[PDB]
Amino acid sequence: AVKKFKPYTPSRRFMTVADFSEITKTEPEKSLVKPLKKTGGRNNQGRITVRFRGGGHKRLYRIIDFKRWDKVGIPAKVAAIEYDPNRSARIALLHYVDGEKRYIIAPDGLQVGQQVVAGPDAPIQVGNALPLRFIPVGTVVHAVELEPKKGAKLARAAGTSAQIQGREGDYVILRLPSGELRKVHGECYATVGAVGNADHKNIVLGKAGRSRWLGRRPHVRGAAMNPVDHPHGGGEGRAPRGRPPASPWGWQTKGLKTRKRRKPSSRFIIARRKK
Amino acid sequence: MKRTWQPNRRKRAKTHGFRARMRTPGGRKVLKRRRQKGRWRLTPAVRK
RNA sequence: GCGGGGUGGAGCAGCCUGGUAGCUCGUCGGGCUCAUAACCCGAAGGUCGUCGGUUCAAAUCCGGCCCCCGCAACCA
RNA sequence: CCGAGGGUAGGGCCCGUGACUGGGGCGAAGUCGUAACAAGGUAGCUGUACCGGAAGGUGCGGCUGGAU
RNA sequence: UGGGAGAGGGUGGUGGAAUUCCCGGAGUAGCGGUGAAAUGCGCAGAUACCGGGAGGAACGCCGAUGGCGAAGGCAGCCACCUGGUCCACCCGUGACGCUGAGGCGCGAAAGCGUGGGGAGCAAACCGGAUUAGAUACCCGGGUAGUCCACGCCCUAAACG
RNA sequence: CGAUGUCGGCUCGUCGCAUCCUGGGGCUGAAGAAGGUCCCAAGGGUUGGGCUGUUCGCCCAUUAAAGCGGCACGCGAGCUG
RNA sequence: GAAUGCCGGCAUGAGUAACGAUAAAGAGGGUGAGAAUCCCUCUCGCCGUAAGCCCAAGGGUUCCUACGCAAUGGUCGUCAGCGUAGGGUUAGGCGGGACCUAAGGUGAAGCCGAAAGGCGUAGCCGAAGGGCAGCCGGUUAAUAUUCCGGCCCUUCCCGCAGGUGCGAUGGGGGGACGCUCUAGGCUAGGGGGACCGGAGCCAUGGACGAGCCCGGCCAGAAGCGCAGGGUGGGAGGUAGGCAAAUCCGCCUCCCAACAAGCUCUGCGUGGUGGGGAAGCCCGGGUGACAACCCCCCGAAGCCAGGGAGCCAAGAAAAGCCUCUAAGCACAACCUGCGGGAACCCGUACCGCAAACCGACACAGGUGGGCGGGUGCAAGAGCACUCAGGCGCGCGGGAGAACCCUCGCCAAGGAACUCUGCAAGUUGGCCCCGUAACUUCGGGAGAAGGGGUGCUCCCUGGGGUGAUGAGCCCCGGGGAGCCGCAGUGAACAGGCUCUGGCGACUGUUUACCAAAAACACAGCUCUCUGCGAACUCGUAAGAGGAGGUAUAGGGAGCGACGCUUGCCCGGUGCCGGAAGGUCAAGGGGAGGGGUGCAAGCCCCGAACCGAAGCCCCGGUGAACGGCGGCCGUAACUAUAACGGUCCUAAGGUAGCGAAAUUCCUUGUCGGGUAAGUUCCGACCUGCACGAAAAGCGUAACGACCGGAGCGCUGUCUCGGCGAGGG
RNA sequence: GAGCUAGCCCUGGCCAGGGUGAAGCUGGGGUGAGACCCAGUGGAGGCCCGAACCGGUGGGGGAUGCAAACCCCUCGGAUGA
RNA sequence: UGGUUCGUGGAGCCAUGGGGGAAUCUGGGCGGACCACCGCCUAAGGCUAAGUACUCCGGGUGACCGAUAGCGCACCAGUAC
Numbered sequence A: 001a002v003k004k005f006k007p008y009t010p011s012r013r014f015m016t017v018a019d020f021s022e023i024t025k026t027e028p029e030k031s032l033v034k035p036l037k038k039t040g041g042r043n044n045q046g047r048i049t050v051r052f053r054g055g056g057h058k059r060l061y062r063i064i065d066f067k068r069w070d071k072v073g074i075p076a077k078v079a080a081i082e083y084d085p086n087r088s089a090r091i092a093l094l095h096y097v098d099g100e101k102r103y104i105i106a107p108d109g110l111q112v113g114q115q116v117v118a119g120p121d122a123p124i125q126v127g128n129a130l131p132l133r134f135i136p137v138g139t140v141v142h143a144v145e146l147e148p149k150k151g152a153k154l155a156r157a158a159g160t161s162a163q164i165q166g167r168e169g170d171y172v173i174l175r176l177p178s179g180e181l182r183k184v185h186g187e188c189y190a191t192v193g194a195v196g197n198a199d200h201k202n203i204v205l206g207k208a209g210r211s212r213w214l215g216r217r218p219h220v221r222g223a224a225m226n227p228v229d230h231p232h233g234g235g236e237g238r239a240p241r242g243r244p245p246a247s248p249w250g251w252q253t254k255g256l257k258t259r260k261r262r263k264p265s266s267r268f269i270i271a272r273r274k275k
Numbered sequence B: 001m002k003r004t005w006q007p008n009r010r011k012r013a014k015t016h017g018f019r020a021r022m023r024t025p026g027g028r029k030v031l032k033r034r035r036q037k038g039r040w041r042l043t044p045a046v047r048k
Numbered sequence C: 001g002c003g004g005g006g007u008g009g010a011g012c013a014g015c016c017u018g019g020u021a022g023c024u025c026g027u028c029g030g031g032c033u034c035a036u037a038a039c040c041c042g043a044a045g046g047u048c049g050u051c052g053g054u055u056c057a058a059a060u061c062c063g064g065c066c067c068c069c070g071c072a073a074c075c076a
Numbered sequence D: 001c002c003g004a005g006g007g008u009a010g011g012g013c014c015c016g017u018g019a020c021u022g023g024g025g026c027g028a029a030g031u032c033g034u035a036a037c038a039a040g041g042u043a044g045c046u047g048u049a050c051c052g053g054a055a056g057g058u059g060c061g062g063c064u065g066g067a068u
Numbered sequence E: 001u002g003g004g005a006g007a008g009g010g011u012g013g014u015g016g017a018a019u020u021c022c023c024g025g026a027g028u029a030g031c032g033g034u035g036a037a038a039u040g041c042g043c044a045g046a047u048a049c050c051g052g053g054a055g056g057a058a059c060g061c062c063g064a065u066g067g068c069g070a071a072g073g074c075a076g077c078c079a080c081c082u083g084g085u086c087c088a089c090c091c092g093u094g095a096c097g098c099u100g101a102g103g104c105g106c107g108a109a110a111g112c113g114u115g116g117g118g119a120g121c122a123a124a125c126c127g128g129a130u131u132a133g134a135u136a137c138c139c140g141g142g143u144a145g146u147c148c149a150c151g152c153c154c155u156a157a158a159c160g
Numbered sequence F: 001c002g003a004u005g006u007c008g009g010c011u012c013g014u015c016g017c018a019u020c021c022u023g024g025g026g027c028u029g030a031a032g033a034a035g036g037u038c039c040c041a042a043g044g045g046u047u048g049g050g051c052u053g054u055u056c057g058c059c060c061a062u063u064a065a066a067g068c069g070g071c072a073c074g075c076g077a078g079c080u081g
Numbered sequence G: 001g002a003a004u005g006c007c008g009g010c011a012u013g014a015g016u017a018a019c020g021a022u023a024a025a026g027a028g029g030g031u032g033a034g035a036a037u038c039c040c041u042c043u044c045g046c047c048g049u050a051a052g053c054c055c056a057a058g059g060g061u062u063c064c065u066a067c068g069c070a071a072u073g074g075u076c077g078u079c080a081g082c083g084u085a086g087g088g089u090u091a092g093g094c095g096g097g098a099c100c101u102a103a104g105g106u107g108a109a110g111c112c113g114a115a116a117g118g119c120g121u122a123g124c125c126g127a128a129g130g131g132c133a134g135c136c137g138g139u140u141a142a143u144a145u146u147c148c149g150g151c152c153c154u155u156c157c158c159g160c161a162g163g164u165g166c167g168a169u170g171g172g173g174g175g176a177c178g179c180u181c182u183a184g185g186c187u188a189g190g191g192g193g194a195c196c197g198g199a200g201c202c203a204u205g206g207a208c209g210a211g212c213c214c215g216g217c218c219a220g221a222a223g224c225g226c227a228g229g230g231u232g233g234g235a236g237g238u239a240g241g242c243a244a245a246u247c248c249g250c251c252u253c254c255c256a257a258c259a260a261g262c263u264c265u266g267c268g269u270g271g272u273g274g275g276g277a278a279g280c281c282c283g284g285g286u287g288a289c290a291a292c293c294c295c296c297c298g299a300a301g302c303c304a305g306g307g308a309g310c311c312a313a314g315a316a317a318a319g320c321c322u323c324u325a326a327g328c329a330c331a332a333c334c335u336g337c338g339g340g341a342a343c344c345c346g347u348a349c350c351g352c353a354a355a356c357c358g359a360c361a362c363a364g365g366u367g368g369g370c371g372g373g374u375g376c377a378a379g380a381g382c383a384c385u386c387a388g389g390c391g392c393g394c395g396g397g398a399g400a401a402c403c404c405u406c407g408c409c410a411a412g413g414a415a416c417u418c419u420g421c422a423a424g425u426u427g428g429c430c431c432c433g434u435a436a437c438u439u440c441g442g443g444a445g446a447a448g449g450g451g452u453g454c455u456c457c458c459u460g461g462g463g464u465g466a467u468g469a470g471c472c473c474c475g476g477g478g479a480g481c482c483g484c485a486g487u488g489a490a491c492a493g494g495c496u497c498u499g500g501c502g503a504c505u506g507u508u509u510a511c512c513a514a515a516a517a518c519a520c521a522g523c524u525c526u527c528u529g530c531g532a533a534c535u536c537g538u539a540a541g542a543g544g545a546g547g548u549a550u551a552g553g554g555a556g557c558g559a560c561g562c563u564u565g566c567c568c569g570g571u572g573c574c575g576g577a578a579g580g581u582c583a584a585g586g587g588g589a590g591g592g593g594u595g596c597a598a599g600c601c602c603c604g605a606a607c608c609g610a611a612g613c614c615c616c617g618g619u620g621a622a623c624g625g626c627g628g629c630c631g632u633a634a635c636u637a638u639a640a641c642g643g644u645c646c647u648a649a650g651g652u653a654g655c656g657a658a659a660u661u662c663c664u665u666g667u668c669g670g671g672u673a674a675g676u677u678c679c680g681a682c683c684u685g686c687a688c689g690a691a692a693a694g695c696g697u698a699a700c701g702a703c704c705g706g707a708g709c710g711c712u713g714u715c716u717c718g719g720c721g722a723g724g725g
Numbered sequence H: 001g002a003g004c005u006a007g008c009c010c011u012g013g014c015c016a017g018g019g020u021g022a023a024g025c026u027g028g029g030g031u032g033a034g035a036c037c038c039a040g041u042g043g044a045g046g047c048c049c050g051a052a053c054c055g056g057u058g059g060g061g062g063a064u065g066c067a068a069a070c071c072c073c074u075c076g077g078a079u080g081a
Numbered sequence I: 001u002g003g004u005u006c007g008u009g010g011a012g013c014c015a016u017g018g019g020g021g022a023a024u025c026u027g028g029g030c031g032g033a034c035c036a037c038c039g040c041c042u043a044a045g046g047c048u049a050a051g052u053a054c055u056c057c058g059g060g061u062g063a064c065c066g067a068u069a070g071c072g073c074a075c076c077a078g079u080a081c
């Protein structure tokens, strides 16, 4: 669910917040957190290289496990489900019988107290991890590796999920959350289910301040600038674009494709995203 | 109102200091010029 | 001031490339119908805004004048 | 003390009237089309939705109060 | 107490036929559509044909002048959860009944909100014809919507 | 053009007379009262408001009358803006 | 002799403006060649959430004393932050270092770059963060948590004793964390006392009094008491915490659990040491054997790493405890005690300012802590006042115009003016009472009105006590008294109606613009499958992001409601393996220079040969665009209808003389005595129109219009008065 | 040259007092169960009034200034972007 | 592509970033596209005085300056500020 407010201030009228129903532990596992080096959007030159960033709430980075083939055959109990400020999804605390504790992204349906496991033999049940080739075609899956032993790269955002469409040789065919049809390697691990917190997108920030909390500084339109600043800049009074609409750096921004043509991974993408 | 000189010794030394000058090719040249001119103080005096 | 027009009753071609005025509509005569509209078959009507000129000959090229359309009339 | 009433302020209901405007009724010798009554020339009617100078049209579902 | 019939309702699964799109093979001069045409599609290889894949929606024969529900309404198949109802036995209760101003719920289609989905169909809209005109009827396209979830709307030739 | 600050208002005036008023006249289609028209006359006077930045103009209520112009469209080393 | 020339000197304005906050002065005594200005006394005024006090920056001897007054001081000067000289800063415990890390900086490894140089995990550096052992008083002209006095504590070295598998840069625990609100118990600080101590006073009509005035504490080891914080104990298994591990993690069992225990802190007491007023007398002496007590208020501070709630989910590392490895177990470490050892730098003074930043002894700026009392609902507000500090480094007169800042005004009350600009009014608190509209929160302190002091009597509830006395807090009900006036002074909304624009709180042209502009939640288009797109850099490497399509970039639009039409010819973007054009290169028909020759050398047709362009198609919340003429209806008028030309298609809804309307003060209506403005209408819209969004919208605005009430020197129309000039 | 100014990063600090009273929770009512309503408790918020503090709306003064942006009155924010 | 007087010119020579890629005296470069002839020279390794440039320093000499000159400084100047 999402939680609405009564309109006792102009902003609380439209503001909505997460329900936090699935959360069972409001404290991070101390040995799994490290400080998050905030950037402000600036690179090693001190130069802003992504605009309009900074001033967000301080965060502690949780160390998440995106390999999971790291501990094949050793089951684990789901001790708690926690809030993670560095992602849209929720995270699950895993207490391995091994005695090791690691975080995974919390799938939808994952119950606190239940047990999960990784490996070619794993039961096809929510929260288990297997190479793609050992997962039944048609079952939905998340946290998918793109290449073997390189870590979960696909379907990690709240509510996302990939789906297996069929097999072809060493590779299997996934339909990524964007709808793109892609061949991913059979040995790539993935975790069955969809990501939890699917309600994430129905949140209405509600006021200028909330975006500021999220480290999102105000964004300024090209049209509201000057000819030095932006292609859309200047003009007496208000003004339309007067040219094909562009980024501050000059390139066209309505329709213009940007994926590199001669990219080697083209051979593995079957159907570019719908819509 | 607040004027432009707001003294701070750490700032002064870490900026126009001797070690600062020696670290950069441009700064070493400052010292060369100042010595060649015969300046009594190659670097801003600051009381640490 | 700069550009563009005036041709059967209406609206448009023809002008640039001189000779050769065309299309739709309307109009008159006759068909079909009880009659009417539609429809079919026939026919009439423009001397091309004018006045001048070039030429063998001017709706056509050129000039004067009338009229209408559009743009401009800024720094002050 | 209460007190006719006068005064100040803010409410409620009613009536009259108002540039302009919405449709309604009648008038009728105007204009445009022909939606309905026959299978009315696309069976009609219907709730709803969108559209059109206008009757109306169309989509969706419904009724026969529909000919053959 | 014992028995029956049924598209009654809800949730989760699931089966085949067909349309569409996509990939491959093979193949060539048209296909489509109509009263007749045209728009449209097709030598940039369409139609028609075989193989594969994807996706949505509706369930042909059974099917009925049938069944079920208070009405709206309900149809492939399976399972679970659940309402109404009829029969037989004539065992139990002892008039505990009927109707019902308000109230409450349910309420086809279209329509609205948020998020999915989107094959076919199809308001609006575009084009081709017909026509005096054709903001229509016919044809080629086509967006909402039609589908799912949750929440609204509460109308009707909601009719026997 | 090595600067002559530019509308209107306020303030303070001063002059011109082609005189709005008041004074004096001739003619009148001047009965009277009131007007018309021209002549003489610059001594004084020449109101308060609504609209608009306005000057101007329209309008209200009065008035003997509600005059027109010059002074760098008088006046920003006087004010306003 | 001229260059608004250059450098210097000296004039003019002129004995003129000014002499730097309107907190303010007056006399007496002293000093001295000289005194409004220096010293002393008394009187007067000003600050007191400071104009007092204590830190940190920064300044760098300005500190203290002696002797001076040429210059500095906006006057004067005997004085001074000035001249000369002499003196003055004392730490194992305060701050920094011999500790730790943060951003960042630097940088073994490694990577990159013409050179210079740019990167870079570790490591190192880097603090106002973590860590860490001193409190009260006394003393100097000047330093003190630094010297002295009392009472405490830390580490290091060594030795003794008891104890133990000791041992680490390695493993683990811990350190270790947000915002808001908050409990119990305390302390700081404060108020009162009929109680305790004290020099004294009795005036001027009264008072020898429960009279007045002054003061009634500070620090303190162990022990203890009160209040908090932290923490389960035992055993078995073990494959995880890059070796090991008895530790930690995980699983099972037993006992304990809102108990305790154990441990750490706060507060109280505490052996002991300190201080100790008014007044009087010359900083000190005295008071004084000073007293050192009870009650109440009470923190934002302490116990603390406490509690609850919420979402935006809230540093690291060392010290510290535990584990074990090499090693070594004559060692080593722990615990207790003893002796010895304990280094470098700062320390003066100013510090909201005459010592810092502003050229000045400059009405400006500058971070943290303390900041008393009474009254006013509260308070860090306001008035007065304590402690302390001041009267601002030119004065004395006079009583013009005029200026500034201020007070009052007859009758009128916006007639002022671009405009109520300005100044009035309103003003705090309690009660009563509040409309359209609305997103149901609001609008709202709407509007409007009543009350407000003091006195006596009666009475209700809470805190602290004890359940009572006293004290403190919140009231209620009667009968009265005085004044023009009871938030009696000071601090403290004028209100309503109605349009435009922007939803809103916010942001902006530092120094002529705070707005309607920017941003904003929210909507849409588009790009991006991750070594992502994109951005910075030549590169390496970075950001994006330790993120992964519910995510990230670009753009437009701008809460929300109802909506967002038609045009793909042109431009752009997207798709299109055909065809056309197409560069290097391939190819070499054929031709040439040359040589006696083989040969060497040059040119070169056909054909093959990318992107891009052409060509085909799509695409509007892509760039953009969205007609002309003529006719027609029972009188006119207009034209639902028709004709025709052009176009890629000819502006749909809605709105409209508008932030847009030229003609224009359009026309009509409202409001006014009068309305170029304003509002409501009309529609021949010069030249609105649908995300450079269209039309509305409650609430909001130091935005921009119009109107009314209230009230005023804005005005008729000026007058008087005050203070600084 | 970022000791002024702009943004961001690390680490600290500051915001008197008063006012309005969201969700939640508890109890009562309500129903078949509910939704819901009511009271109490609670203490939310780019909420309200107003110091510090951050500003700089209007006017007046200042203009060889006290000041190369100041002063007086007035006014905006003041738990948050 | 640079260098040469040589700016694509008939453009050789010297140098070399990319591609291809030999030979050892019958070997190879050059004499301004190219060929022949005639001549010159020995690439792909290194060193090498002197003649030449300069004036911080020392000296000598001026139809050079003489304190607004001559060095920025005759003087406690790269100082005061």
Ligand SMILES: [Mg+2]
Binding pocket: A001, A019, A021, A199
């Ligand atoms: Mg949920």
Ligand SMILES: [Mg+2]
Binding pocket: A003, A004, A005, A006, A012, A013, A014, A015, A016
């Ligand atoms: Mg809400």
Ligand SMILES: [Mg+2]
Binding pocket: A004, A005, A006, H022, H023
């Ligand atoms: Mg709420």
Ligand SMILES: [Mg+2]
Binding pocket: A004, A005, A006
């Ligand atoms: Mg709600």
Ligand SMILES: [Mg+2]
Binding pocket: A007, A008, A009, A010, G441, G442
């Ligand atoms: Mg509100």
Ligand SMILES: [Mg+2]
Binding pocket: A009, A010, A011, A013, G504, G699
């Ligand atoms: Mg609001």
Ligand SMILES: [Mg+2]
Binding pocket: A018, A088, A200
């Ligand atoms: Mg969330």
Ligand SMILES: [Mg+2]
Binding pocket: A018
């Ligand atoms: Mg969240």
Ligand SMILES: [Mg+2]
Binding pocket: A003, A017, A018, A019, A020
């Ligand atoms: Mg919630």
Ligand SMILES: [Mg+2]
Binding pocket: A018, A019, A020, A021, A022, A023, A197
């Ligand atoms: Mg949740």
Ligand SMILES: [Mg+2]
Binding pocket: A027, G314
């Ligand atoms: Mg936390």
Ligand SMILES: [Mg+2]
Binding pocket: A030, A033
């Ligand atoms: Mg850690």
Ligand SMILES: [Mg+2]
Binding pocket: A034, A035, A036, A037, A061
């Ligand atoms: Mg990190």
Ligand SMILES: [Mg+2]
Binding pocket: A036, A037, A038
């Ligand atoms: Mg980081």
Ligand SMILES: [Mg+2]
Binding pocket: A044
């Ligand atoms: Mg760095």
Ligand SMILES: [Mg+2]
Binding pocket: A045, A046
């Ligand atoms: Mg740099």
